[PDB]
Design a protein around this ligand. Structure first.
Ligand code: SPH
Lengths: 57, 276, 238, 251, 221, 202
């Protein structure tokens, strides 16, 4: 039941093993390693796509 | 590549074309995606920086104090009573409220940790031997039997969850699932309570969260002792929707969102700069 | 039983720990989530959409709508200064209660490049150009347009397209700069000058308007989370 | 290009000058799926009767004007079969296509900000008093902002540099916004989907969003030019469906 | 808590000249603070309101002579210029952040017209036969023409001082020559009245180092 | 405006049921009430007939809008003998009544009793009559049958167990005194009793 994942290391032995003890999904620890993102819903919320090299109007 | 690491700066050079990366039109509501290579001559720089600290889990996932409950072992008035309730909400402290108000609809599993201290009340004498006190914190769901006073029938917790903490141990801690009625916590509810558009306005109507009754388990001490219970919240498994703009004017009331009228920023002398 | 030993750091309450904890309502049935539009997974998605800045924040214009309106007039001699401020996006009086400023005050360090988008708001028949310089802090803030043309600058020509973007670079000896900045991590100075003039046909008013924006590019980052020095309180709100 | 041509039901909109159509948070409005619903009754779906362009009342843009706000779906409560099916129901789920338009000249100047803020919980004009429901929004009237502090008794706070919600007015650009700059632009068009934390909600006890039009750069012209330039807002519901039939409301 | 040490300092002003009131707070200082003057006719006379830095709201009666500003932790009120008639007694009041409620009213000071300082002049007169049969004795002495109230008054009856049943009063400003005056009402018995021969009235000033002696004849008819 | 005019004044007994009525010109409700004993004013109630925190159990219903009846000072405990005010709160210009006091000290009427002083002297002749030991503090002092009401110095009376003392100093030259006739007249509001006394000449 053990799950081995990587550790938050620097940039140029590094694993950690967590085991869920309790029988609830809300009683687990934090998953701090979801860095995914998509800013296209706030920066470019347009219907017709605008390319940078093209003129805008 | 990996996920979350920032983009790079590709190298460029002197250009002379009909392309206009600089010019744009903000009337479309479209923020420009201008890479710094599109304006000047940049070098190839590898960016190893990450956006780990700016995720919603690392931004909200820290403990913050919410409510400071006071209750003693001898009743002297109706604010230092033998027991003390708290209508459970995240809007009474200022620093956690401004973080939760940055998004409209949130959805988090809560995590509550109490730190409970004590201090003898001021009197004419202090010498007494007392065993270590036991504090009881009973969650009351919305629509349950509330304890009217001490030694009540409803302090038995036949279905309510509760803790029993001896002074001097590790602080109590328990996790709470997401327990709204809808699909998200509404941090902003522009609307009324009744269908006639009257009654109470704001997000007060959707704050049906229960209560939290603090008391001592011990019958009495020799001399009266005041206790303080500080409640810390830590939202985990957070999913936030519809980001708001962060509130500028400071808060006034714990129910609604009223405010003084404030200026936009701090002032300065002039619009220019006057040194060489 | 199994012989354990309490290490230093036991029975403590660290504020930023991630430990498991026993649930209070076991086998709770949560309410199923739905596709709600506008989800955020990162604070830099909020700090990447633009927001206007109060460049005209001389007293008393901060508690009014004339804080964002930069006055632009037909000059009588070219090379004057339209405005100017320091590039401290967490401590300057201009860029700290904006959207990029109100996020970066929650953190202690920042990095990357910003985008100052300038949008004209005058008549359709008014023309003219501007010079928007950015001088890194070698020899102080520049004095005139000749002394600012040596730095990083763009010459925005107001025309059919209504708005240009000066993209400030990332020129620093440190990989991160503090928001409440000291003298070790100075960033630079932003000026904006009249290139030629503002010329008009007759029956057009003199005063025009330029709205400045601020954003972040695709390589912005923050670090070292804190609490913001923007909201204070004495007691609990009741 | 600049030319757009919107058509919904039997009432179209033709604009020679436009910027682009910002669509919500990047999603087109659609009906409720079978795995997100909570009701069990079969909903009604009038597609030509409700999903059409309704033109609201006109407002006047002068030099010393502060701004205006409409609250939806209260501003469409008396317009056609949209406001008649609103009274005979309990739940509603619509998306919108807000089309604000203002033409002056090639000699005028000015700039608006057409934004749609979901859950615009407004602060009161005076604190420690709940206010009247007719001072947030009426059935068709455009409630206006002010330049100074509103020392009212049963109204909202209409400080234009605070936008009624206590936030600085500059940071309203996170919400789906467009600028009507009279130098280039003429009309702003936004397509905003149904944004709520529940699948379907009542339409009288909950104003979903608030269309705000705020002049940032004030309007200047020569005195010889035409001094009356209006701002007309035509809003069209989109993908409307209703549930929970009932008698006539609304109380 | 909530301590207001309002409102130093005003003594005394010239008609047409300036003074600067002040008020301090120690509770939640970013409130909706204002002022409230008062004169003993009631006569409300509200004068100013400010919230929170800008938006000063002077009244229509005095719209161009006051000025309030803050802060911090204290706030002032400058007057240019005072004119008689004027209050009186000035109070520093507060509210919460809405809020035209006026709670939290602290103590306050006074300010009046400008005169030269003048010593109080006391004079005593023979009584009538209206207090004889009742067993009492109401000896009459009316002072005249003093300013300000930094004086002293005494009742030395032929070398015998009386503090039992004495009466003290201070009038407001009379409108013929801007004078002030006090009164005297005594309550003696029968056996103590005729023990003396001529009652003596004295009053001191801060300028004069000696009281004024006035003698009347009781048995004169 | 025009506030109010509240009437005023109240009356004994503190057994209960005291009412204070006012009028207005608009003003749909924003009225308050304020009372003071010897200090700066207190504050009850709020911008309604709703209660305040810290005030006593008397919380009066006030009708809407321009009548606001009443204070409803039920079950007095003789602490509340004070002077009440009533603000309106619709700028411009937020002025009060400012009502009338209510102490009034049961029960007897106490018609007026005077002890007139006769001056006997110098270049000025000062004259005043000692209205002594009266219950009702309202009076109306009239000198020289309605001609010498200019130099009258109205003095504060002092309470020592239901007795008051007003005195009105009038100053004449020696062109009338001691030849002509001088007499102070008191029009009495509460009991309507007439006093007339002549200064004896030497
Ligand atoms: C005392 C034994 C442990 C039980 C602890 C108490 C359980 C209650 C936890 C509260 C659950 C969160 C409810 C929502 C909180 C805020 O009001 C929302 N953000 C506003 O709707």
């Amino acid at each position: 039941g053990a799950q081995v994942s990587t550790q938050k290391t620097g940039a140029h032995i590094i694993h950690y093993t967590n085991i869920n003890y309790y029988k609830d999904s809300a009683s687990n620890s934090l998953n701090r390693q979801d860095f995914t993102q998509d800013p296209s819903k706030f920066t470019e919320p347009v219907k017709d796509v605008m390319i940078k090299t093209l003129p805008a109007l | 590549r990996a996920v979350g690491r920032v983009a790079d700066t590709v190298a460029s050079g002197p250009v002379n074309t009909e392309q206009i990366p600089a010019l744009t039109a903000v009337e479309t509501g479209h923020t420009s995606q201008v890479v710094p290579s599109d304006t000047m001559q940049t070098r190839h720089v590898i960016n190893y920086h990450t956006r780990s600290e700016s995720s919603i889990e690392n931004f909200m996932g820290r403990a913050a104090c919410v409510y400071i409950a006071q209750y003693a072992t001898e009743k002297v008035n109706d604010e230092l009573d033998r027991y003390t309730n708290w209508e459970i909400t995240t809007r009474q402290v200022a620093q956690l409220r401004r973080k939760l108000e940055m998004f409209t609809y949130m959805r988090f599993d809560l995590e509550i940790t109490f730190v409970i201290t004590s201090s003898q009340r001021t009197s004419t004498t202090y010498a007494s031997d007392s065993p270590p006190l036991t504090h009881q914190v009973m969650y009351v769901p919305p629509g349950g039997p509330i304890p009217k006073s001490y030694e009540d029938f409803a302090w038995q917790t036949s279905t309510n969850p509760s803790v029993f903490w001896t002074e001097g141990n590790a602080p109590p801690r328990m996790s709470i699932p997401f327990m709204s009625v809808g699909n998200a916590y509404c941090n902003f509810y522009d609307g009324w309570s009744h269908f006639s558009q009257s009654g109470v306005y704001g997000y007060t109507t959707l704050n049906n969260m229960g209560h939290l009754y603090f008391r001592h388990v011990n019958k009495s001490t020799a001399y009266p002792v005041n206790s303080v219970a500080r409640v810390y919240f830590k939202p985990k498994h957070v999913k936030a929707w519809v980001p708001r703009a962060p509130r500028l004017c400071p808060y006034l009331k714990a129910r609604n969102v009223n405010f003084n009228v404030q200026g936009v920023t701090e002032s300065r002398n002039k619009i220019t700069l006057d040194r060489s | 039983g199994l012989p354990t030993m309490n290490t230093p750091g036991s029975t403590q309450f660290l504020t930023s720990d991630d430990f498991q904890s026993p649930s209070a309502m076991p086998q709770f049935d949560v309410t199923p989530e739905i596709q709600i539009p506008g989800q955020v997974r990162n604070l830099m998605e909020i700090a990447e959409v633009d927001s206007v800045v109060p460049v005209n924040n001389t007293e008393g214009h901060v508690n009014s709508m004339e804080a964002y309106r930069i006055p632009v007039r037909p000059q009588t001699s070219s090379g004057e200064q339209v405005f100017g401020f320091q590039l401290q996006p967490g401590h300057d009086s201009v860029l700290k209660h904006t959207l990029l400023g109100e996020i970066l005050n929650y953190y202690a360090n920042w990095s990357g490049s910003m985008k100052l988008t300038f949008m004209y708001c005058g008549a359709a028949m008014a023309t003219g150009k501007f010079l928007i310089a950015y001088s890194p802090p070698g020899a102080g803030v520049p004095g005139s347009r000749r002394d600012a043309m040596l730095g990083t600058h763009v010459i925005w020509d107001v025309g059919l397209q209504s708005s240009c973007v000066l993209c400030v670079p990332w020129i620093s000896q440190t990989n991160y700069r503090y928001v409440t900045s000291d003298a070790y991590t100075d960033a630079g100075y932003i000026t904006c000058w009249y290139q030629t003039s503002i010329v008009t046909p007759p029956d057009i008013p003199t005063t025009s308007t330029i709205l400045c924006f601020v954003s972040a590019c695709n390589d912005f980052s923050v670090r070292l989370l804190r609490d913001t020095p923007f909201i204070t309180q004495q007691a609990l709100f009741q | 290009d600049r030319v757009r041509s919107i058509t919904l039901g039997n009432s179209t909109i033709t604009t020679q000058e436009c910027a682009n159509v910002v669509v919500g948070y990047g999603v087109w409005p659609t009906y409720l799926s079978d795995h997100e619903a909570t009701a069990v009754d079969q909903p009604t779906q009038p597609d030509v009767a409700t999903c059409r362009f309704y033109t609201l009342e006109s407002v006047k843009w002068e030099s010393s004007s502060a701004g205006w706000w409409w609250k939806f779906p209260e501003a469409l409560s008396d317009m056609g079969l949209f406001g008649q099916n609103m009274q005979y129901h309990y739940l509603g789920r619509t998306g919108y296509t807000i089309h604000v338009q203002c033409n002056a000249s090639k000699f005028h100047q000015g700039c608006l900000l057409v934004v749609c803020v979901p859950e615009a919980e407004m602060g009161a004009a005076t604190t420690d008093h709940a206010f009247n429901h007719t001072k947030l929004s009426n059935i068709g009237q455009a409630m206006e902002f002010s330049a100074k502090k509103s020392t009212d008794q049963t109204g909202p706070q209409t400080a234009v540099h605070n936008a009624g919600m206590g936030v600085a007015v500059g940071n309203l650009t996170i919400f789906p916004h467009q600028w009507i700059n009279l130098r280039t632009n003429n009309s702003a068009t936004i397509v905003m989907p149904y944004i709520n934390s529940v699948p379907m909600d009542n339409m009288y006890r909950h104003y979903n969003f608030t269309l705000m039009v705020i002049p940032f750069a004030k309007l200047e012209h020569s005195p010889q030019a035409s001094t009356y330039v209006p701002i007309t807002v035509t809003v069209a519901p989109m993908c409307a469906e209703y549930n929970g039939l009932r008698l006539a409301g609304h109380q | 808590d909530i301590e207001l040490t309002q409102s130093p300092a005003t003594l005394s002003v010239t008609p047409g000249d300036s003074v600067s009131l002040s008020c301090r707070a120690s509770q939640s200082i970013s409130n909706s603070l204002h002022w409230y003057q008062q004169r003993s006719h009631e006569s409300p006379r509200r004068l100013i309101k400010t919230a929170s830095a800008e938006k000063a709201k002077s009244i229509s009666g005095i719209p161009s002579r006051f000025s309030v500003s803050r802060g911090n932790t204290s706030f002032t009120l400058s007057i240019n210029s005072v004119e008689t008639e004027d209050f009186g007694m000035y109070f520093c009041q507060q509210a919460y952040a809405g809020s035209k409620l006026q709670p939290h009213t602290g103590a306050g000071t006074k300010l009046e017209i400008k005169r030269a300082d003048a010593a109080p002049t006391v004079s005593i007169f023979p009584p009538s036969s209206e207090q004889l049969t009742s067993g009492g004795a109401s000896v009459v002495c009316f002072l005249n023409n003093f300013y300000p109230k930094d004086i002293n008054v005494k009742w030395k009856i032929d070398g015998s001082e009386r503090q039992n049943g004495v009466l003290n009063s201070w009038t407001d400003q009379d409108s013929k020559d801007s004078t002030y005056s006090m009164s005297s009402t005594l309550t003696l018995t029968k056996d103590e009245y005729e023990r003396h021969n001529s009652y003596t009235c004295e009053a001191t000033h801060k300028t004069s180092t000696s009281p004024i002696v006035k003698s009347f004849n009781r048995n004169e008819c | 405006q025009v506030q109010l005019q509240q009437s005023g004044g109240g009356l004994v007994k503190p057994g209960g049921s005291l009412k204070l009525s006012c009028a207005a010109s608009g003003f749909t409700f924003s009225s308050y009430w304020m009372h003071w004993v010897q200090t700066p004013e207190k504050r009850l109630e709020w911008v309604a007939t709703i209660s305040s925190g810290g005030g006593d159990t008397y919380y009066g219903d006030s009708v809407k809008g321009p009548a606001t009846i009443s204070r409803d000072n039920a079950k007095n405990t003789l602490y509340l003998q004070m002077s009440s005010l009533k603000s309106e709160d619709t700028a411009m210009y937020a002025c009060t009544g400012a009502g009338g006091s209510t102490y009034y000290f049961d029960y007897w009427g106490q018609g007026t009793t005077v002890t007139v002083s006769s001056p006997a002297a110098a270049s000025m002749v000062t004259l005043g009559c000692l209205v002594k030991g009266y219950f009702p503090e309202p009076v109306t002092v009239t000198w020289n049958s309605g001609s010498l009401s200019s130099g009258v110095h109205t003095f504060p009376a002092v309470l020592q167990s239901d007795l008051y003392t007003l005195s009105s100093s009038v100053t004449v030259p020696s062109s009338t005194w001691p030849s002509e006739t001088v007499t102070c007249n008191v029009a009495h509001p509460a009991s309507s009793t007439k006093v007339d006394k002549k200064i004896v000449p030497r």
